[PDB]
Amino acid sequence: RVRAEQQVASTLQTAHEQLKRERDAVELDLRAHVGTMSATLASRILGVDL
């Protein structure tokens, strides 16, 4: 039991590390689109394609 649980403990520990590594790379690589779709709703709320 303790072998298993310690394994999963540090498993999710440096898993968590990889979680953050993915996270803040995506946190920036998801900004180039702040334009595109904002445009969409900006017209979808206004009723003219602009």
Partner: protein, 517 residues
């Protein structure tokens, strides 16, 4: 890795398709607010028990309706209510999502996941106040719901479709009884048979958050979270949440019951729901009665507990079993809410602290406990080996005054005394260790067939334990055909008796003596 542009394009999906045209709405205005209640002027078309939307995503329930205002119960974040805010109408009475995606989750009394594992994929919605099955929509309670507890399953059997009250002072083992009843359905779930699977709903009303966390941990370590939902209204939630939690838990599990499935539902501390409703009704200035309860609190509990039914075959044959829990004070079952729920339910299990301290655990008082369904909620084997048990214990309890004068008693009286001591030591059971019905049949066979008169009373438990161990390893055929045929025919009894004699000549007591006749 993480699905990055999956994220960003999911939300672009959401917005591009953002369409919310200008509909005409009927609004009101908050005129006062205090202690979790808000009065709203306007809203001529709001109906009773309707959901209202305050600014900031706050929700309320229109309870009081009169010519001036609408008294509504704020369903959380009450400190953001101000006089002068605008209240929008929903047009819908309280409903919750229902579906199979609720298995293994912990949700609000609104269908919102509070465990943080994402949203719950919902089949349908279901209103909280849908009527109970008609008097002709039902069927006699005939199948057993095994709790895995010898005292309950032998003395006060529970059927599928029955309302069994678990009532006790405090720290008597009610939550443990219900958690073991839940854990015992693990093997029925593994069978993959929809006529034997039992889905469980555990409603937690007014409990500390870490207590609900511990209950969920116990249900996970037993593998019981594949078929269990938890509707949690923690002690920090509003009074409206604690009042609505069992109705949310009963709206879920009625979808299942009407889909032809068998469900068990545990209302942990209906007393706290009664007190939350009393708080609500006193803040709305409704007339108080005995113990300041509103006057429809009996209705509050009976409307909830009559939705636990056994449906007829033309409605699918599903069932919903209820296990409402009531916490008494100083064993006062003559209080108001205890009296109501004892009146409502189909049987009671009285847990006591004096029995709990004497080592009788589960501390079920088998003298006053009762099940009005009875032998109809038992298999043949258990109905046979445990029909002897009730008056055995009656005789023992009326003889135990002569425990110090067994020399002066008749032969049959001393026999009853020893048999009763053995049987009392038989019904004891550890925590979180439920037994299948075949092992309970074998243990009560040990008790009532007389195969324990040779074992010291301080050795029964271990003896029984080891014997079952032996039978699980060596003679599995007896347990197997008990499980399959639901009856202990005479040949199985012969083989069982011989197994018991062999194990006896192999068994060693703690005083060093023998256990052979």
């Amino acid at each position: 890795t993480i699905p990055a542009d999956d994220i960003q394009s999911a939300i672009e999906e959401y917005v591009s398709s953002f369409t919310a045209d200008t509909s005409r709405e009927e609004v009101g205005t908050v005129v006062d607010a205090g202690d979790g209640i808000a009065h709203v002027e306007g809203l001529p078309s709001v109906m009773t028990q309707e959901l209202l939307e305050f600014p900031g995503g706050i929700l309320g329930v229109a309870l009081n309706l009169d010519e001036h205002s609408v008294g509504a119960v704020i369903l959380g974040d009450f400190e953001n209510i101000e006089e002068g805010q605008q209240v929008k109408r929903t047009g819908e009475v309280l409903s919750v999502p229902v579906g199979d995606g609720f298995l293994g989750r912990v949700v609000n009394p609104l269908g919102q996941p509070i465990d943080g594992r994402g949203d719950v994929d919902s089949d349908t919605r279901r209103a909280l106040e849908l009527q109970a099955p008609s008097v002709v929509h039902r069927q006699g309670v005939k199948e057993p719901l095994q709790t895995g507890i010898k005292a309950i399953d032998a003395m006060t059997p529970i059927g599928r479709g029955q309302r069994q009250l678990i009532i006790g002072d405090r720290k008597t083992g009610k939550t443990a009884v219900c958690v073991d009843t839940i854990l015992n359905q693990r093997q029925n779930w593994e069978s993959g048979d929809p006529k034997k699977q039992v889905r469980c709903v555990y409603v937690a009303i007014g409990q500390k958050g870490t207590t609900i966390a511990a209950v969920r941990r116990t249900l996970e370590e037993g593998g019981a979270m594949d078929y269990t939902t938890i509707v949690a209204a923690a002690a920090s939630e509003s009074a409206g949440f604690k009042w609505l939690a069992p109705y949310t838990g009963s709206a879920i599990a009625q979808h299942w019951m009407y889909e032809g499935k068998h469900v068990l539902i545990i209302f942990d501390d209906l007393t706290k729901q009664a007190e939350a409703y009393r708080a609500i009704s006193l803040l709305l200035r409704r007339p108080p009665g005995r113990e300041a309860y509103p006057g429809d609190v009996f209705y509050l509990h009976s409307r909830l507990l009559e939705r636990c039914a056994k449906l007829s075959d033309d409605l699918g044959g599903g069932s919903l079993t209820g296990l409402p829990i009531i916490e008494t004070k100083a064993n006062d079952i003559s209080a108001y809410i205890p009296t109501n729920v004892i009146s409502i339910t189909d049987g009671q299990c009285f847990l006591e602290t004096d029995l709990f301290n004497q080592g009788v655990r589960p501390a079920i008082n088998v003298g006053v406990s009762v099940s009005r369904v009875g032998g109809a909620a038992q298999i043949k084997a258990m109905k046979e080996v445990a029909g002897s048990l009730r008056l055995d214990l009656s005789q023992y309890r009326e003889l135990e005054a002569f425990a110090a004068f067994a020399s002066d008693l008749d032969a049959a009286s001393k026999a009853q005394l020893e048999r009763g001591a053995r049987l009392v030591e038989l019904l004891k059971q550890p925590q979180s260790q439920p037994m299948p019905v075949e092992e309970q049949v074998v243990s009560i066979f040990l008790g009532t067939g007389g195969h324990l008169d040779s074992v010291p009373v301080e050795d029964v438990r271990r003896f029984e334990t080891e014997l079952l161990d032996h039978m699980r390893a060596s003679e599995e055929e007896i347990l197997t055909e008990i499980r399959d045929s639901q009856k202990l025919t005479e040949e199985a009894a012969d083989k069982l008796t011989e197994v018991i004699k062999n194990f006896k000549k192999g068994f060693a007591a703690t005083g060093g003596g023998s256990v052979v006749p």
